[PDB]
């Protein structure tokens, strides 16, 4: 479970897939990662994007994305 | 097995619910409290033709104006000698009078049922709650004759006519129509012996059973073997005159 | 069997026995109670689920305030939560006996963690299956510490429990960017009803009742107050003002 | 293998509770059916207690404490001859030492953790006895529903027992009418009589097996039995 | 110490502690006794075959409570002597209080009273000890026989005996021996006792020991020579065909 | 029967199953640290993770002040970490009450290990598998580090760390200690010694941190303090200017 | 069934001592059904190959929907079900998969008219607590020691074909016998029949029955009986 | 599957009661309060065993008491016993 330097290149591909607003901070989300891997990183915007389906918008707020980060830590193991 | 704290699916202890099986293994006894006196009796049966019924006491006396009996193992019968008899004297030590049968039973039940796994202040070391069915009867200075019973489960209830032992299922069924408010002392002496005849497996004998009574004047008085044999002869003459 | 469910005196490969893990599910099945830590003081929140009209509002209060200077609130099981209240208020009385001074929040936190860690060492002692949220005002400033059922506790600028614990704290981080130190805590009282209202969407069954017991660094300066009258209905109407339907 | 999550007191179930409490909740229906409420100024407790035989009478669960307070317990009472008598000692202990009216909060607060000590401290069984306690003070009458799980709450009225849910729900519509009517304790006791008829779908209303308690401001605590309930039958 | 109880109450009344406490007598040696008019006789046996010891140097069932009361039983060895010393202190306790010797009736209650706390209270297990208690009362020559069960059950008896196959041996005394007509001469109780001792141990009379309890503080222990005197009389009229 | 999952008995492998699970995972916290000794001082550095925006960085610490001259390094579960911390602080004051000198390293490390070894005797009470490292600066002997293992193992350590990377930093420090043939760091200016220990820490990690993401402290002569947010940030910036 | 909207019970559980008159009642009722009877046990069900105990038995379950009027009693469920903690030591997975295979036939669809399910074991809850969940068992057979007067017909059934002396009293005979089962009462008459072998009795007398209870239950039975082995689990 | 509450158990019983013929004397909130921690598998057995109580009584349709008698049916060990109550 490496630091930001290990998962940095994953976040770039993770960012380019999701089309959202241009204001985001992913540095605080790195500390939020506990027991998360390359598959759990995809889960972040996967569940966060589900909340915006009924909102008729594809924009993902930085706090809405962090809500799914905590949600994966509850279902771990 | 597992911890004693395990309850029943209804929320009750196992030793309390299973305490009724040790009563049937004991002696069958039926107490009755009439308008005149309170009829007490038990069944000695026999364990052998050489058994002596003189030194065995299945009917004890807590105090002069009251009485007690037992159906079950004889171990717990002596636990109340240091408790029920002590509390009866403790009442005379403080209030110096005859304790009410209604209050004495509830007072004994406080000293009767105490158990559990363990406790520092109270003694829960007792495992089985009761192995014996104890009868509590006497005379009240206000109400009158009261027939109570100490159940193996530990509770207490007011019993006009109570039947305990293995034959309590068939004896209490007919006891509903037998007991009446007009039943006197003499009429209840031949009634108990007639019911015990269908209960007792052997011939009625002075050594196979023991009866007594509670008098508001003379007090608790046991029936001697010479007097008990008289009630046996009166029963044989009464049953022949029924038809 | 595995030994972790029956005995808490053994060692788990993950460091947390299965018996301790069962305490987490008991707390999450209770009622959501959040907390507020800002520059003007520390504000709590508590809700009472109404099962039937027989229940009377403004009676049962899960917030237990030690003296006037320290508040506390629990969740999950009632007896395990009130067991700590008798011990927490007894040590506070013993504190003022020896030192003749009010007890600060950090000195109050170590007395709680000592009881949890000691009950997990003995196999014959049943541990605590509830979570503890406590705060107040001391000679220093606002401090909020939440005691987990495992015994781990440290600095928290916000608290949550029940349903959506980590989901309710998402609104707390939104106020961090708006107010760096939290600034005015009076508006947070209205925000508290909105955070609890966020959990009312999925959990809506019968009527709800909200109670708030807070303490301030400025207004109270160590005293204790309660939300009632106009302040009671003003915070409730604010949570329903955003979404009327 | 339910012996692990049940027979052990200190163990925790996968749901976060103790299965020993589940059996204690069932003991309420296995016992006698009681009905109680709080009208404020007056208070009525109607407890129906069945006996074991036609020639036998029940035992009194209700234990008198003081003139302004009373208690009626439901389900069974294995330890109540000790606990409630010890609580009755605390009733006078608060009056003769602290001079307290003994409201429904602290009276159920100590008993909440008392039954928990049996689960917390090894070597004892949980009590598992339902207690309905009412008391009067300067703030009026208050009802205390005590569950084996240590429930501390206040209700206008409640009915617990076997098939007693009918009397609990049906009186919720007229509940506001009963509490607003004061000064006539006879009609308040008759309100509980209708709750007994709704709670018995098999037998009829008894006479000696019916027990009614009442407490109020001027009227002290007493238990109606025999000819006292003749007008309420 | 141990807060729990070492016993568990039975659903049907069949208790593990009551089970093997009675068979402890079935595994041990038999204790034979019979009452009388002015005295009481208590016999016994020994399980050991080869005997390198003497009867006086090694006591087995020999124990004394009051001056004229000799108490002999077999339920066990170690747990049996514990109740004896407590009874002797209790026998002195009546001399420290009542100043008079205690009757045999309470001496049975005290032995069962200690066994009462074993079956009731926890922290201590019960014994397999079953005591046959005898002796007299002050200014009374009438003996007593009480069979004490490990569960605290006692009853009056006459020819009762406990041990290996003692129920069958007692059946021999249920007919020839009449409780209503007890024998007079002290040696008459021995004639019926020796005949009952040959149904278990048979040969090896060195193991056979007879203890006669007599009033005025007198105890007579019969030897092997006096026992063989009644053995010859058994085969006299029994082998002859009438 | 035979399983240690409840009781504790000797396994057929000669090793207790409780001792196994205590030694296996101490990294469930998922945190690393390091401890080194200077000339007249002692430098300790511990990683810090703050997975929330609401956490107060001054509250979370793995280094607690015991005495004026004594620090501490603890890794393991948070609730069980303070169990040995509150006891050591209570036992540290007992030294002055009995003696009235400052707690030496040879005592506090021995008392907590002997208390943990009693848990091997007691089957009912649970021991602690928490890593215990007592760091301080002695007056006569200078810097000393004694790591107390949960099984009672404690000895002199010139350097120590935690986590699975403990052996990685040990390799880099062993080569520097072999050529210099000294156990401690003979270089003065502990401000530059802190940056020296970070270099060995970066090699195991490979990333940087902020002022509140690293728990760092320095044990000096007759003083022990904790670096604030400004003191930590100053060293992380100044290390980039040198190398 | 169609008018009221209710369906008859399919699955049913048998728990108690090993064939004391419980199992005897199971085979007696099946004879009056007048349908196809098939007996399949669980002990041999294990075998080795995966599917020999599930897929091969599934063919019997599939044929049950084809051929109607079929009745099958599932036997020896202790060798099939049961509760797990470490999830098995190996080799019992197919034993547990057969338990789950029985669920599949009751999972998607199945008629309850021509297909019945009955288990046999010595204790009710020893199975998987998920297996004992309702819907594969609609009702449970509670088998315990009945009352005294209820078993008086058992003494009659064995005496219908048995010659007994006229004037015998069964009231005193039943008093010697405590709570028991049907098969335990036949053992009293079984040894009583042996009393007429050695002692050579013409018919069955009262002294033979009064002594047999003390000879069999007290004398012969002694140890080796099921008493404390059933609580819940 | 979470433990169904009062209103949660009511909606589950409404599914199995669609084919049931009742007297319209039933209160849904009344029956759910007497039930605790009963999933839909146990709630289904209540409606099935409800009509079986009326089978011996010859009733044309189930009533509010028959649903309470469904609890009286033996599933969770709700049956009777001796001693304290008789």
UniProtKB/Swiss-Prot annotation, chain A:
Biological role: The 26S proteasome is involved in the ATP-dependent degradation of ubiquitinated proteins. The regulatory (or ATPase) complex confers ATP dependency and substrate specificity to the 26S complex.
Transmembrane parts of this sequence: none
Protein name, entry field: 26S proteasome subunit RPT4
Superkingdom of the organism of origin: Eukaryota
UniProt modification remark: N-acetylated by NAT1.
Family classification: Belongs to the AAA ATPase family.
From Swiss-Prot, chain B:
SUPFAM superfamilies: N-terminal nucleophile aminohydrolases (Ntn hydrolases) (SSF56235)
CDD domains the record matches: proteasome_alpha_type_5
One of the GO biological process terms: proteasomal ubiquitin-independent protein catabolic process
Effect in UniProt of substituting residue 41 to D: In DOA5-1; slight decrease in activity
Subcellular location as annotated: Cytoplasm; Nucleus
Main location: cytoplasm
UniProt entry keywords in alphabetical sequence: Cytoplasm, Nucleus, Phosphoprotein, Proteasome
Family: Belongs to the peptidase T1A family.
NCBIfam families, alphabetized: PRK03996.1
Additional record remark: Present with 17100 molecules/cell in log phase SD medium.
Protein known as: Proteasome subunit alpha type-5
Gene from which this protein is expressed: PUP2
From Swiss-Prot, chain F:
CDD domains linked to this entry: proteasome_alpha_type_6 (cd03754)
GO biological process, one term: proteasome-mediated ubiquitin-dependent protein catabolic process
Principal location listed in the UniProt entry: cytoplasm
UniProt cross-references to PROSITE patterns, sorted A to Z: PROTEASOME_ALPHA_1, PROTEASOME_ALPHA_2
Domain of life: Eukaryota
Keywords annotated in UniProt: Acetylation, Cytoplasm, Isopeptide bond, Nucleus, Phosphoprotein, Proteasome, Ubl conjugation
Coiled coil: none
Subcellular location field: Cytoplasm; Nucleus
Cross-link entry Glycyl lysine isopeptide (Lys-Gly) (interchain with G-Cter in ubiquitin), positions: 223
Family affiliation: Belongs to the peptidase T1A family.
Function noted in UniProt: The proteasome degrades poly-ubiquitinated proteins in the cytoplasm and in the nucleus. It is essential for the regulated turnover of proteins and for the removal of misfolded proteins. The proteasome is a multicatalytic proteinase complex that is characterized by its ability to cleave peptides with Arg, Phe, Tyr, Leu, and Glu adjacent to the leaving group at neutral or slightly basic pH. It has an ATP-dependent proteolytic activity.
Protein name per its UniProtKB record: Proteasome subunit alpha type-1
From Swiss-Prot, chain G:
PTM per Swiss-Prot/TrEMBL: The N-terminus is blocked.
Chief location: cytoplasm
A single cellular component GO annotation: cytoplasm
Biological processes per GO annotation: positive regulation of protein catabolic process; positive regulation of RNA polymerase II transcription preinitiation complex assembly; proteasome regulatory particle assembly; proteasome-mediated ubiquitin-dependent protein catabolic process; ubiquitin-dependent protein catabolic process
Keyword annotations from UniProtKB, A to Z: ATP-binding, Cytoplasm, Nucleotide-binding, Nucleus, Phosphoprotein, Proteasome
Location in the cell: Cytoplasm; Nucleus
Residue numbers binding ATP: 16-23
Disulphide bond pairs: none
GO molecular function, one term: proteasome-activating activity
Family listed: Belongs to the AAA ATPase family.
SUBUNIT field: Interacts with UBR1 and CIC1.
Misc: Present with 105 molecules/cell in log phase SD medium.
Free-text function comment from the UniProt entry: The 26S proteasome is involved in the ATP-dependent degradation of ubiquitinated proteins. The regulatory (or ATPase) complex confers ATP dependency and substrate specificity to the 26S complex.
Protein name: 26S proteasome regulatory subunit 7 homolog
Provenance organism: Saccharomyces cerevisiae (strain ATCC 204508 / S288c)
UniProt gene name: RPT1
């Amino acid at each position: 479970l490496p630091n930001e330097a290990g998962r940095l290149e994953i976040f770039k591909i993770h960012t380019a897939k999701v089309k959202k607003t241009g204001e985001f901070d992913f540095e605080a989300a790195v500390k939020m990662s506990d027991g998360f891997n390359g598959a759990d990183i995809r889960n972040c915007a996967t569940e966060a994007g589900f909340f915006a389906i009924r909102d008729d918008r594809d924009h993902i707020n930085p706090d809405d994305l962090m809500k799914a980060v905590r949600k994966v830590a509850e279902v771990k193991k | 097995d597992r911890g004693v704290s395990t309850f029943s699916p209804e929320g009750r202890l196992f030793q309390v619910e299973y305490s009724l099986e040790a009563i049937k293994l004991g002696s069958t006894a039926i107490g009755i409290a009439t308008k005149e006196g309170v009829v007490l009796g038990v069944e000695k049966r026999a364990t052998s033709p050489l058994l002596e019924s003189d030194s065995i006491e299945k009917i004890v006396e807590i105090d002069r104006h009251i009485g007690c009996a037992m159906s079950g193992l004889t171990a717990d019968a002596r636990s109340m000698i240091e408790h029920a008899r002590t509390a009866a004297v403790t009442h005379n030590l403080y209030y110096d009078e005859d304790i009410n049968v209604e209050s004495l039973t509830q007072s004994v039940c406080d000293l009767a049922l105490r158990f559990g796994e363990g406790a520092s202040g109270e003694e829960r070391l007792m495992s089985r709650p009761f192995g014996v069915a104890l009868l509590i009867a006497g005379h009240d200075a206000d109400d009158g004759y009261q027939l109570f019973h100490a159940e193996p489960s530990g509770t207490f209830y007011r019993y006009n006519a109570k039947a305990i032992g293995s034959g309590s299922e068939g004896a209490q069924a007919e006891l509903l129509n037998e007991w009446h408010s007009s039943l006197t002392l003499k009429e209840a002496e031949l009634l108990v012996l007639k019911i015990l005849k269908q209960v007792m497996e052997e011939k009625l004998d002075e050594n196979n059973a023991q009866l007594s009574c509670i008098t508001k004047q003379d007090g608790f008085k046991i029936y001697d073997n010479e007097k008990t044999a008289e009630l046996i002869k009166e029963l044989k003459e009464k049953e022949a005159a029924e038809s | 069997g595995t030994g972790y469910d029956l005995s808490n005196s053994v060692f788990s490969p993950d460091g947390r026995n299965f018996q301790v893990e069962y305490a987490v599910k008991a707390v999450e099945n209770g009622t959501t109670s959040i907390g507020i830590k800002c520059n003007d003081g520390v504000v709590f929140a508590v809700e009472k689920l109404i099962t039937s009209k027989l229940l009377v509002p403004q009676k049962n209060v899960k917030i237990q305030v030690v003296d006037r200077h320290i508040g506390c609130v629990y969740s999950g099981l009632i007896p395990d939560g009130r067991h700590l209240v008798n011990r927490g208020r007894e040590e506070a009385a013993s504190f003022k006996k020896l030192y003749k001074t009010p007890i600060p929040i950090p000195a109050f936190a170590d007395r709680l963690g000592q009881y949890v860690q000691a009950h997990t060492l003995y196999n014959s002692v049943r541990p605590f299956g509830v979570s503890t949220i406590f705060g107040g005002v001391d000679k220093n400033g606002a401090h909020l510490y939440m005691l987990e059922p495992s015994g781990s506790y440290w600095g928290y600028k916000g608290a949550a429990t029940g349903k959506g614990r980590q989901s309710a704290k998402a609104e707390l981080e939104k106020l961090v960017d708006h107010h760096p130190e939290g600034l005015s805590a009076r508006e947070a009282v209205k925000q508290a009803a909105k955070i609890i209202y966020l959990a009312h969407e999925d959990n809506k069954e019968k009527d709800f009742e909200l109670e708030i017991s807070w303490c301030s660094l400025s207004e109270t300066n160590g005293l204790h107050k309660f939300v009632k009258g106009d302040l009671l209905q003003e915070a409730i109407d604010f949570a329903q003002k955003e979404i009327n339907g | 293998f339910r012996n692990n999550y049940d027979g052990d007191t200190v163990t925790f179930s996968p749901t976060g509770r103790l299965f020993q409490v589940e059996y204690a909740l069932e003991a309420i229906k296995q016992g006698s059916v009681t009905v109680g409420l709080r009208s404020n100024t007056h208070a009525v407790l109607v407890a129906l207690k069945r006996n074991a035989d036609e020639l036998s009478s029940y035992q009194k669960k209700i234990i008198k404490c003081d003139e302004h307070m009373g208690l009626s317990l439901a389900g069974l009472a294995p330890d109540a001859r000790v606990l409630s008598n010890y609580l009755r000692q605390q009733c006078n202990y608060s009056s003769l030492v602290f001079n307290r009216k003994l409201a429904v909060e602290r009276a159920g607060h100590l008993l909440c953790d008392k039954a928990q000590k049996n689960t917390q401290s090894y070597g004892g069984r949980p009590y598992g006895v339902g207690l309905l306690i009412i008391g009067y003070d300067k703030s009026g009458a208050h009802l205390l529903e005590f569950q084996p799980s240590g429930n501390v709450t206040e209700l206008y009225g409640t009915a617990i027992g076997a098939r007693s849910q009918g009397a609990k729900t049906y009186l919720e519509r007229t509940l506001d009418t009963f509490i607003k009517i004061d000064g006539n304790p006879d009609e308040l006791i008759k309100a509980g009589v209708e709750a007994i008829s709704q709670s018995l779908r098999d037998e009829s209303l008894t006479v000696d097996n019916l027990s009614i308690a009442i407490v109020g401001k001027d009227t002290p605590f007493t238990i109606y039995d025999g000819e006292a309930v003749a007008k309420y039958i | 110490g141990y807060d729990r109880a070492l016993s568990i109450f039975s659903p049907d009344g069949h208790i593990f502690q009551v089970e093997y406490a009675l068979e402890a007598v079935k595994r041990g040696t038999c204790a034979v006794g019979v009452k009388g008019k002015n005295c009481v006789v208590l016999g016994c046996e020994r399980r050991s075959t080869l005997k390198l010891q003497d009867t006086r140097i090694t006591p087995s069932k020999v124990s004394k409570i009051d001056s004229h009361v000799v108490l002999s039983f077999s339920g066990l060895n170690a747990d049996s002597r514990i109740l004896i010393e407590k009874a002797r202190v209790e026998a002195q306790s009546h001399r420290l209080t009542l100043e008079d010797p205690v009757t045999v009736e309470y001496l049975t209650r005290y032995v069962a009273g200690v066994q009462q706390r074993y079956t009731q209270s926890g922290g201590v297990r019960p014994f397999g000890v079953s005591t046959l208690i005898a002796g007299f009362d002050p200014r009374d020559d009438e003996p007593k026989l009480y069979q004490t069960e490990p569960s605290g059950i006692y009853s009056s008896w006459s020819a009762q005996t406990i041990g290996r196959n003692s129920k069958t041996v007692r059946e021999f005394l249920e007919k020839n021996y009449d409780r209503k007509e007890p024998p007079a001469t002290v040696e008459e109780c021995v004639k019926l006792t020796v005949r009952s001792l040959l149904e278990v141990v048979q040969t090896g009379a060195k193991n056979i020991e007879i203890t006669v309890v007599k009033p005025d503080s007198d105890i007579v222990a019969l030897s092997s020579e006096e026992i063989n005197q009644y053995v010859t009389q058994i085969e006299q009229e029994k082998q002859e065909q009438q | 029967a035979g399983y240690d999952r409840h009781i504790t008995i000797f396994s057929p492998e000669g090793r207790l199953y409780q001792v196994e699970y205590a030694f296996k995972a101490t990294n469930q916290t998922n945190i690393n640290s390091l401890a080194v000794r200077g000339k007249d001082c002692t430098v300790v550095i511990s990683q810090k993770k703050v997975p929330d925006k609401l956490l107060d960085p001054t509250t979370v610490s793995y280094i607690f002040c015991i005495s004026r001259t004594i620090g501490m390094v603890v890794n393991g579960p948070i609730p069980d970490a303070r169990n040995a911390a509150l006891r050591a602080k209570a036992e540290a004051a007992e030294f002055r009450y009995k003696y009235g000198y400052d707690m030496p390293c040879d005592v506090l490390a021995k008392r907590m290990a002997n208390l943990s070894q009693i848990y091997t005797q007691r089957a009912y009470m649970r021991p602690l598998g928490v890593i215990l490292t007592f760091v301080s600066v002695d007056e006569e002997l200078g810097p000393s580090i004694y790591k107390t293992d949960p099984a009672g193992y404690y000895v002199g350590y010139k350097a120590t760390a935690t986590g699975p990377k403990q052996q990685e930093i040990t390799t880099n420090l062993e080569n520097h200690f072999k050529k210099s043939k000294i156990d401690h760091i003979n270089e003065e200016s502990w401000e530059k010694v802190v940056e020296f220990a970070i270099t060995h820490m970066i090699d195991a990690l490979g990333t940087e941190f902020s002022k509140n993401d690293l728990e760092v402290g320095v044990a000096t002569k007759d003083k022990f303090f904790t670096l604030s947010a400004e003191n930590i940030e100053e060293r992380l910036v100044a290390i980039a200017e040198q190398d | 069934f169609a008018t009221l909207g209710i369906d008859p019970p399919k699955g049913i559980l048998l728990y108690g001592p090993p064939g004391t008159g419980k199992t005897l009642c199971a085979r007696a009722v099946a004879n009056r059904t007048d349908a196809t009877f098939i007996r399949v046990i669980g002990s041999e069900l294990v075998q080795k190959y995966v599917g020999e105990g599930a897929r091969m038995v599934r063919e019997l379950f599939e044929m049950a929907r084809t051929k109607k009027a079929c009745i099958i009693f599932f036997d020896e469920i202790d060798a099939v079900g049961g509760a797990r903690f470490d999830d098995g030591a190996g080799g019992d997975n197919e034993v547990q998969r057969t338990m789950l295979e029985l669920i599949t036939q009751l999972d998607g669809f199945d008629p309850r008219g021509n297909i019945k399910v009955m288990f046999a074991t010595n204790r009710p809850n020893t199975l998987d607590p998920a297996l004992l969940r309702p819907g594969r068992i609609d009702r449970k057979v509670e088998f315990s020691l009945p009352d005294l007067e209820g078993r008086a017909n058992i003494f009659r059934i064995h005496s219908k074909s048995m010659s007994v002396e006229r004037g015998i009293r069964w009231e005193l005979i039943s008093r010697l016998c405590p709570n028991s089962t049907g098969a335990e009462l036949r053992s009293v008459c079984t040894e009583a029949g042996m009393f007429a072998i050695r002692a050579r009795r013409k018919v069955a007398t009262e002294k033979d029955f009064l002594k047999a209870v003390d000879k069999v239950i007290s004398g012969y039975k002694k140890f080796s009986s099921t008493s404390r082995y059933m609580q819940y689990n | 599957f979470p433990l169904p509450s009062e209103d949660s158990r009511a909606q589950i019983l409404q599914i199995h009661s669609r084919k049931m013929t009742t007297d319209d004397d039933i209160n849904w909130q009344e029956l759910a309060r007497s039930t605790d921690e009963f999933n839909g598998a146990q709630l289904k057995a209540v409606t099935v065993e409800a009509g079986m109580i009326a089978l011996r009584n010859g009733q044309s349709s189930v009533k509010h008491e028959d649903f309470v008698e469904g609890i009286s049916e033996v599933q969770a060990r709700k049956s009777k016993s001796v001693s304290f109550y008789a």
